[PDB]
Design a protein around this ligand. Structure first.
Ligand SMILES: *[C@@H]1O[C@H](CO)[C@@H](O[C@@H]2O[C@H](CO)[C@@H](O[C@@H]3O[C@H](CO[C@H]4O[C@H](CO)[C@@H](O)[C@H](O)[C@@H]4O)[C@@H](O)[C@H](O)[C@@H]3O)[C@H](O)[C@H]2NC(C)=O)[C@H](O)[C@H]1NC(C)=O
Ligand SMILES: *[C@@H]1O[C@H](CO)[C@@H](O[C@@H]2O[C@H](CO)[C@@H](O[C@@H]3O[C@H](CO[C@H]4O[C@H](CO)[C@@H](O)[C@H](O)[C@@H]4O)[C@@H](O)[C@H](O)[C@@H]3O)[C@H](O)[C@H]2NC(C)=O)[C@H](O)[C@H]1NC(C)=O
Ligand SMILES: *[C@@H]1O[C@H](CO)[C@@H](O[C@@H]2O[C@H](CO)[C@@H](O)[C@H](O)[C@H]2NC(C)=O)[C@H](O)[C@H]1NC(C)=O
Ligand SMILES: *[C@@H]1O[C@H](CO)[C@@H](O[C@@H]2O[C@H](CO)[C@@H](O)[C@H](O)[C@H]2NC(C)=O)[C@H](O)[C@H]1NC(C)=O
Ligand SMILES: *[C@@H]1O[C@H](CO)[C@@H](O)[C@H](O)[C@H]1NC(C)=O
Ligand SMILES: *[C@@H]1O[C@H](CO)[C@@H](O)[C@H](O)[C@H]1NC(C)=O
Ligand SMILES: *[C@@H]1O[C@H](CO)[C@@H](O)[C@H](O)[C@H]1NC(C)=O
Lengths: 344, 722, 98, 49, 49
C-alpha cells in the first residue's frame, strides 16, 4: 500500500506496475480477511477451531492499512467499523488500551509492548482513519495520551525515547498545536544532527539500560522514530510553516540515505512508516502544474547567478561558487515547486 | 460507607419509542449529576439525556431515540457521573432497531363464491396495543396463480384502521387467494381466503372422539350428531369410518398408508345421535403405527344430501404413558439456605394419580428419598445445601427399570422422567436475596404478592439499621414498573421473610421478568430474578350483547356493544353455515399477542452484539498454591451480571456485580353476510338496530372488536341469534 | 455471479446484500484460484501431488464465470488469458474440442 | 498407594481450575535423598501419587 | 504407557499364571513382580483397593 502511495506522490509511476501491484493488493486483502474473528478481530493463526483469541496490535495494524488501502482499491467499510468497535471493547479510561497481543514472532512491530506505546499506535491508527477529536473513544484515548506525556516528561528516565516520538505525530494529527510543540521542543533538543542530516536514536550500544526483551529491535527503533517525527513536523492543521518543513527536509536527508540496499528498511513496521512519511513529505514539496521554478542569488557587490528548476532538472545538483571574501548574499526563489539551497 | 452509582438500560433500544432507563445514586457523599450519552460508532451522530439523581432513590427516566437509515445499527452508550469529588464513566455497545408495527386484516368471510364482493379491513397498533394512524404504502390481493389482481397504494389509517372492497370476477380462478400488506419497512403481513363454487350446508356434523387415547387399550367410546338452529336435530343414515396411517410413506401405488379399519353404519335418532364403542385390538396401535383420522357421512334423510365431516383427526396414541414434571422449583440455590422444589405426576390424558410411590434422586447431597403422591398427584419437598456448585436433581417413579426387549429396534414406549440442574450464586459477603418462585399463569386484573427471603450475616458492615431494597419488572423488551422497600436491620440480622405486592395489570405482556437487589456499603450487590407467565389480555373490555334472542324473519333487532367511553368498533355478523363451511381465520387476544415482536428479551442481541472483557485477572495467576498447585481454565458459577443479562438489560456501575474472571310478508332471500360495519361508542355502550334477515334457516353467529386511544383495543365474545 | 447480475437488471437490489454477496464472491474466486494448474487449467483435485491433468469442461466453465465475475469485482486478466491459451492447446480443427 | 490427586478435579476460588502435578521438596524427598524409608503416622509426603 | 494396571486384571493374570505354570513352564519373576505390586495397593482395613 505505502509503496503504491509513495510511487504516486513522487510522480515516477507506471501502469504496467500499478496493475502488477493491485493484483498482489486485492489478493492479500481477501487472504487477510480469511483470519478475521466473528467479533471483527484478527489473530496470527486465524480462527483454528474457534479457540483463537485476538491480538490488539494486529487488529489496529490491519485497520491502519485498511484505512490506507481503501484509497486505491475498494475495501468493505464493514470490516473497519467491525474492527473499530472491537478495539473500543478493549479500551479502559485509565491506561487507554489493553495489551491482548498473543503471537509468535515480534519483528512484526516496534512497540515496546507497553500500554503507552500500544495506545500510542491505536490512537494514530484511529486518528488516521478520518475520526473527529470529539469521538468518545478518542476522548478517553487523548486524555490517557496527555497523562502519558506529562508522566514520560518528568525526566530522562521516562520510558526512554521511543514512546516520546509517537506522542508527537499523535498530538499533531489530533490538533494540540501547543502540546505538539511542547513535546517537539524537548525531542528537537534530544536529537542527533550530523552532516546536514538530523535523526533520533536509543542509547547507541545500551550498557546503562540493561534487561533484554526477547531480541534486539534497536536497528528498527531508530528508522521508525525519525519517520514518525517527520510526520508530526509535516502535520500542522492550517499548513506546516516554512520553519516546520525546512527542519523536516533535514530529517528526510537522513532517512533517504539510511535505506536497505535491496529496497526498503530493516524491520517491516519501520519500512511502512518510512514510506508513509516520505510520501506525505513528497506531497507537500512537489508540484504538478507549476513546472517552472526560477531562482536568483546575488551579492551586494555585482554578483549574479540564476537557475531554472523543473521536472527535467530536479534530479540534478546545480552548483555555483564565486567566492567574495565578505559574504552579503540574497537568495530569491520564484514561481512554483520547492528548491533546497545548501551553502558550504 | 464506600459510595456507589448504578444505571440500568435495555440492550435493545427501540428507535422512535419512549424507552425507559432507571438510575440509583446510592450514597450521600455529595450532590452529583448523572448523564447518559448515546453516540455513533462512525460519524458525528450524538445525544445526551441528563438524569436528575437523588441519594438512595431509584429515580427513572424515558427517552425516544432518533431514527437510523440502517434497519439495525450498533452505537456507543457511555454514562457519566459528574461530581466535585468523584468522576466516574463507563462505555458499552447497545443495538438500536426500528421495530415496526403489528398489523392485521379481518375479512367478511373465509370463503367466496364468484362474482361476490370481498370486503376486508386492515388495522395497525404499537407494542402497547393502541390504534396507530400509520401510512401503509401498499395492500394488494394475490390470486392462486400469483398475479396481483387489485391494489391500494400509499394511504393512512384514520382511526387506526381502514375498510376496503374488491368485486370478484364472474369467471375467477378456483382456489386460494391472499391479501398482503407491505409495511414501509417491507414486512409483508399476509392473510388468505378461498374462492370456489359451492352450495352452503344447512347442518353441522358434531363428531366426538377421545382427544388422546392410551396405547394399552381394548376399545373406545365415539359418537356423531347433526344439528343446525336452536339445536333441532335431523334424521339421517350415517356411515362413519375410523382408520389409521402407520408410516406416511407416500402411497407407492397402493394407498397413502390406507391401513386396516372397521367402518360402521346406522340411523340417527330424533332428539339425539348415533353412539358406538369400537375394539382397538383390530388396529394393533403398536409397531411404528402413528395416528388416526375419523370420517363421517350423515346422509341426511328426506333429501339427497351427503354432508361429510372429517372431524377430530387429532385423536392421539402418544409414545409416552407414565410421566411426571416439575411445577415450582428454584433454578438458583445457595449453600446457606436449603432449597425447595415441587413435582407433579401425570399420565395419558394428563391424569394426576394420587397414592402411588415416587423415587427422588440427588447426586450431590444424596437426597435419595421416597414419598407418595397426595390428592391431585403431587409431592413438595426440600433438601440440605452442603456440596460443590452444579446440583443435578432427577426424579424416577413406579418402574424406571423394565424389559421392553431392545431400545431402538422396532417399537419404544418410554415413560419419561423429570430432571433439573440448579447452580449457585456467587455470594460476595456471604449475603444473598432469594425470590420465592410461583411459576403458573397469573391472571390479569388481579393482584399477586411475591415472597422475598433475606440473609445479611455481617452483610451490613457499616451497621446502620436503614437498608434499601429495589425491584423492577420488565416486559416486551423494556422496563415497565419500578419501586422500592426499606428493610430496617440490626447490625447482624440473617433470619427473616418479607413479601412485595404486584398488580397483574396487562401492560406486562406474556413475559414478566422481575428482579430484586440490595446495595451494600461494602461495594457489593445481592439480588435475584425470576420469570412469571402472565395471561394474554386486552385492556378495552368489550362485550357483544345481542338483545332480541331468537326472533323469526322480523325487523329491527337491538344489537349492542359495551366498550371504552370513546372507541371505534368493527362489527361482523354472518350465517353459521359459511362459518361452518371454512372456519374463519382465528382472531382472538392470543392471535394478537403472537403478532407482537419482542414478546420477551432474554440475553443481549448475541448474534449482532458481543462483549465480555474489561479486566483479565484470569491469566494473572497461572496457578494457585493448592496442596499441589493446579492451573486455571473457566467457570459456570451464577452471579449478578448473569441475572441482568438474562433480563436483557446491561448496567453501568461501580460496585461488584460480575465475577472478576474477565478473559475467556311471506318471502325468502338475502343470506351471505348479514352485517359488516363499524360504530362509535358513547360514554358507556352503543345499540345497533339491525333489520333481521329472512332466509334464516340457521343461527347467526356474530363478533366484533374495538379500538380506543386510552384503553388500547378489545375483542368481543361471539354472541349468536337462533 | 448470475444472482448478483439478475438482481441488478430487475432493479430490486440492496447495498446490505451487495456487500454480503461480494464477500462470498471475492472469497470463492481466491479459493478457486487455489486449484489452478501451472499451464492455466483447473481440475477438481487441483495442484495436489502435481500429477493431475486439466478438466476440459471445468476450465471452460471457470472462464465463462471469470468473464462474468470480472464485471462486479476484479479478476486478474492473466487468469483468463492463461486459461484461453490452454483451451486452444486441446483444440483439433475437426471435432473442435476434446 | 492411596491416590488423592485424582480425587479432586473441580475446585472453587473465583474460577474453576483442573488438576496438574507439582515439583516441590517434601519431607519424604529428603528421607528418600537420604536413602532411608519411613514408617509413620504424620504428614510427610506430597499428595501427587 | 499412559496407564496404571487394573487390580482385577493383574490378580486374574496371576491366578492363571499360577495354573498355567503347571503344564507350560512360566517365568517365576512375572508372578512375584505381580504379587509385589498387589501388596502396594493393600490397605489393612478394606484389604484391597
Ligand atoms: C496520486 O496520483 C494521482 C494522479 O495519478 C493524484 O490525483 C490528482 O489529485 C488532485 C487532488 O488530490 C487533483 O487536483 C485537482 O484539485 C482541484 C483543487 O483542489 C481541491 O482539492 C484539494 C484536495 O485534493 C483541496 O486542498 C482544495 O481546497 C480544492 O478543494 C480540483 O478542483 C480538481 O477537481 C482536482 O481534484 C488532480 O486532478 C488529480 N489528477 C491528476 C491528473 O493530477 C493524487 O493526488 C495522488 N494521490 C493519491 C493518494 O491518490
Ligand atoms: C446494473 O449495474 C450497474 C452498475 O452497478 C448499475 O448502474 C448503472 O451504471 C451504468 C454505468 O456503469 C449507467 O450508465 C448510463 O449510461 C447512459 C449513457 O447513455 C446511453 O443511453 C441513452 C438512453 O438512455 C442513449 O441515448 C445513449 O446513446 C447511450 O447508449 C447515461 O445516460 C446514464 O446517465 C448512465 O451513466 C447506468 O445507467 C446506471 N444505472 C442507473 C439507473 O443510473 C445499473 O443500475 C444496474 N442495472 C441496470 C438496469 O443497468
Ligand atoms: C466520600 O468522598 C471522599 C472524598 O471526598 C472519598 O475519599 C476517597 O477515598 C478513597 C478510598 O476509598 C481514596 O483512595 C481517595 O484518595 C479519597 N479521596 C478522593 C478525593 O477521592 C470517600 O471514599 C467517600 N466516602 C466516604 C465514606 O468517605
Ligand atoms: C421410603 O423411605 C422409608 C424411610 O427411609 C422406608 O421406610 C422403612 O420401611 C421398612 C419396611 O420396608 C420399615 O420396616 C421401616 O420402619 C421404615 N422406616 C425406616 C426409617 O427405615 C420405606 O421402605 C421407603 N419406601 C420404599 C418403597 O422402599
Ligand atoms: C457533526 O458534524 C457535522 C459537520 O460535518 C454537523 O453537520 C453535525 O450536525 C454534527 N453532529 C452533531 C450531533 O453535532
Ligand atoms: C364409556 O362408556 C362407558 C359405558 O358404560 C362409561 O362407563 C364410560 O364412563 C364412558 N367413558 C367416559 C369417558 O365417560
Ligand atoms: C439437613 O437439613 C435437613 C432438613 O430436612 C435435616 O433433616 C438434616 O439433618 C440436615 N443435615 C445436615 C448435615 O445439616
Amino acid at each position: 500500500i505505502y509503496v503504491l502511495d509513495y510511487l504516486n506522490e513522487t510522480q515516477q509511476l507506471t501502469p504496467e506496475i500499478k496493475s502488477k501491484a493491485i493484483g498482489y493488493l486485492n489478493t492479500g486483502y481477501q487472504r487477510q480477511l480469511n483470519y478475521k474473528h466473528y467479533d471483527g478481530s484478527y489473530s496470527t493463526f486465524g480462527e483454528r477451531y474457534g479457540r483463537n483469541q485476538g491480538n490488539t496490535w494486529l487488529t489496529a495494524f490491519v485497520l491502519k492499512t485498511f484505512a490506507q488501502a481503501r484509497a486505491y482499491i475498494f475495501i468493505d467499510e464493514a470490516h473497519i467499523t467491525q474492527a473499530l468497535i472491537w478495539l473500543s471493547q478493549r479500551q479502559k479510561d485509565n491506561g487507554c488500551f489493553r495489551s491482548s497481543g498473543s503471537l509468535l514472532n515480534n519483528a512484526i512491530k516496534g512497540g515496546v509492548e507497553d500500554e503507552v506505546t500500544l495506545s500510542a499506535y491505536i490512537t494514530i491508527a484511529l486518528l488516521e482513519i478520518p475520526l473527529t477529536v470529539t469521538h468518545p473513544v478518542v476522548r478517553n484515548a487523548l486524555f490517557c495520551l496527555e497523562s502519558a506525556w506529562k508522566t514520560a516528561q518528568e525526566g530522562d528516565h521516562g520510558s526512554h525515547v521511543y514512546t516520546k516520538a509517537l506522542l508527537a505525530y499523535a498530538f499533531a494529527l489530533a490538533g494540540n498545536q501547543d502540546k505538539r510543540k511542547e513535546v517537539l521542543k524537548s525531542l528537537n533538543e534530544e536529537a542527533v544532527k550530523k552532516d546536514n542530516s538530523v535523526h533520533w536514536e536509543r542509547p547507541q550500544k545500551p550498557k546503562a539500560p540493561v534487561g533484554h526483551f526477547y531480541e534486539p529491535q534497536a536497528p528498527s527503533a531508530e528508522v521508525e522514530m525519525t519517520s514518525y517525527v517527520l510526520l508530526a513536523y509535516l502535520t500542522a492543521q492550517p499548513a506546516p510553516t516554512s520553519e516546520d518543513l525546512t527542519s523536516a527536509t533535514n530529517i528526510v536527508k537522513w532517512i533517504t540515505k539510511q535505506q536497505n540496499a535491496q529496497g526498503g528498511f530493516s524491520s517491516t513496521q519501520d519500512t511502512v512508516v518510512a514510506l508513509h512519511a516520505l510520501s506525505k513529505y513528497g506531497a507537500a514539496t512537489f508540484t504538478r502544474t507549476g513546472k517552472a521554478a526560477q531562482v536568483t542569488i546575488q551579492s551586494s557587490g555585482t554578483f549574479s547567478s540564476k537557475f531554472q528548476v523543473d521536472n527535467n532538472n530536479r534530479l540534478l545538483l546545480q552548483q555555483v561558487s564565486l567566492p567574495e571574501l565578505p559574504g552579503e548574499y540574497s537568495m530569491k526563489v520564484t514561481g512554483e515547486g520547492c528548491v533546497y539551497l545548501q551553502t558550504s | 460507607g464506600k459510595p456507589q452509582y448504578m444505571v440500568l438500560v435495555p440492550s435493545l433500544l427501540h428507535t422512535e419509542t419512549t424507552e425507559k432507563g432507571c438510575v440509583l445514586l446510592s450514597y450521600l457523599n455529595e450532590t452529583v449529576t448523572v448523564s447518559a450519552s448515546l453516540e455513533s460508532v462512525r460519524g458525528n451522530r450524538s445525544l445526551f439525556t441528563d438524569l436528575e439523581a437523588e441519594n438512595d432513590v431509584l429515580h427513572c427516566v424515558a427517552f425516544a431515540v432518533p431514527k437510523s437509515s440502517s434497519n439495525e445499527e450498533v452505537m456507543f452508550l457511555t454514562v457519566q457521573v459528574k461530581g466535585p469529588t468523584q468522576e466516574f464513566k463507563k462505555r458499552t455497545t447497545v443495538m438500536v432497531k426500528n421495530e415496526d408495527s403489528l398489523v392485521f386484516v379481518q375479512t367478511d368471510k373465509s370463503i367466496y363464491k364468484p362474482g361476490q364482493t370481498v370486503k376486508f379491513r386492515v388495522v395497525s397498533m404499537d407494542e402497547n396495543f393502541h390504534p396507530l394512524n400509520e401510512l401503509i404504502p401498499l395492500v394488494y390481493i394475490q390470486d392462486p396463480k400469483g398475479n396481483r389482481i387489485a391494489q391500494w397504494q400509499s394511504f393512512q389509517l384514520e382511526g387506526g384502521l381502514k375498510q376496503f372492497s374488491f368485486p370478484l370476477s364472474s369467471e375467477p380462478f378456483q382456489g386460494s387467494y391472499k391479501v398482503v400488506v407491505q409495511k414501509k419497512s417491507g414486512g409483508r403481513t399476509e392473510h388468505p381466503f378461498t374462492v370456489e363454487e359451492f352450495v352452503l350446508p344447512k347442518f353441522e356434523v358434531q363428531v366426538t372422539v377421545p382427544k388422546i387415547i392410551t396405547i394399552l387399550e381394548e376399545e373406545m367410546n365415539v359418537s356423531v350428531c347433526g344439528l343446525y338452529t336452536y339445536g333441532k336435530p335431523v334424521p339421517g343414515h350415517v356411515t362413519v369410518s375410523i382408520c389409521r396411517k402407520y408410516s406416511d410413506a407416500s402411497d407407492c401405488h397402493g394407498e397413502d398408508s390406507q391401513a386396516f379399519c372397521e367402518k360402521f353404519s346406522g340411523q340417527l335418532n330424533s332428539h339425539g345421535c348415533f353412539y358406538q364403542q369400537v375394539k382397538t385390538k383390530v388396529f394393533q396401535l403398536k409397531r411404528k403405527e402413528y395416528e388416526m383420522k375419523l370420517h363421517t357421512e350423515a346422509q341426511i334423510q328426506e333429501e339427497g344430501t351427503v354432508v361429510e365431516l372429517t372431524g377430530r383427526q387429532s385423536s392421539e396414541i402418544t409414545r409416552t404413558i407414565t410421566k411426571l414434571s416439575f411445577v415450582k422449583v428454584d433454578s438458583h440455590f445457595r449453600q446457606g439456605i436449603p432449597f425447595f422444589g415441587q413435582v407433579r405426576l401425570v399420565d395419558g390424558k394428563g391424569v394426576p394419580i394420587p397414592n402411588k410411590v415416587i423415587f427422588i434422586r440427588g447426586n450431590e447431597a444424596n437426597y435419595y428419598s421416597n414419598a407418595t403422591t397426595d390428592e391431585h398427584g403431587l409431592v413438595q419437598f426440600s433438601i440440605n445445601t452442603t456440596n460443590v456448585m452444579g446440583t443435578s436433581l432427577t426424579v424416577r417413579v413406579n418402574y424406571k427399570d423394565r424389559s421392553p426387549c431392545y431400545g431402538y429396534q422396532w417399537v419404544s414406549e418410554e415413560h419419561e422422567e423429570a430432571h433439573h440442574t440448579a447452580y449457585l450464586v456467587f455470594s460476595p459477603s456471604k449475603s444473598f436475596v432469594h425470590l420465592e418462585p410461583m411459576s403458573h399463569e397469573l391472571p390479569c386484573g388481579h393482584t399477586q404478592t411475591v415472597q422475598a427471603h433475606y440473609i445479611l450475616n455481617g452483610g451490613t458492615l457499616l451497621g446502620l439499621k436503614k437498608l434499601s431494597f429495589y425491584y423492577l419488572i420488565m416486559a416486551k423488551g423494556g422496563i415497565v414498573r419500578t419501586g422500592t422497600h426499606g428493610l430496617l436491620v440490626k447490625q447482624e440480622d440473617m433470619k427473616g421473610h418479607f413479601s412485595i405486592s404486584i398488580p397483574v395489570k396487562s401492560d406486562i405482556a406474556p413475559v414478566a421478568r422481575l428482579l430484586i437487589y440490595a446495595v451494600l456499603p461494602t461495594g457489593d450487590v445481592i439480588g435475584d430474578s425470576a420469570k412469571y407467565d402472565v395471561e394474554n389480555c386486552l385492556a378495552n373490555k368489550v362485550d357483544l350483547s345481542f338483545s332480541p334472542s331468537q326472533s323469526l324473519p322480523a325487523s329491527h333487532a337491538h344489537l349492542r356493544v359495551t366498550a371504552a367511553p370513546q372507541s371505534v368498533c368493527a362489527l361482523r355478523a354472518v350465517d353459521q353455515s359459511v362459518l361452518l363451511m371454512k372456519p374463519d381465520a382465528e382472531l382472538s387476544a392470543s392471535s394478537v399477542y403472537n403478532l407482537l415482536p419482542e414478546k420477551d428479551l432474554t440475553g443481549f442481541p448475541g448474534p449482532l452484539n458481543d462483549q465480555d472483557n474489561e479486566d483479565c485477572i484470569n491469566r494473572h495467576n497461572v496457578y494457585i498454591n493448592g496442596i499441589t498447585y493446579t492451573p486455571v481454565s473457566s467457570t459456570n458459577e451464577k452471579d449478578m451480571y448473569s441475572f441482568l443479562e438474562d433480563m436483557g438489560l446491561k448496567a453501568f456501575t461501580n460496585s461488584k456485580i460480575r465475577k472478576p474472571k474477565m478473559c475467556p310478508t311471506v318471502r325468502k332471500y338475502f343470506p351471505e353476510t348479514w352485517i359488516w360495519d363499524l360504530v362509535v361508542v358513547n360514554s358507556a355502550g352503543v345499540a345497533e338496530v339491525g333489520v333481521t334477515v329472512p332466509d334464516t334457516i340457521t343461527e347467526w353467529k356474530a363478533g366484533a372488536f374495538c379500538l380506543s386511544e386510552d384503553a388500547g383495543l378489545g375483542i368481543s365474545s361471539t354472541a349468536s341469534l337462533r
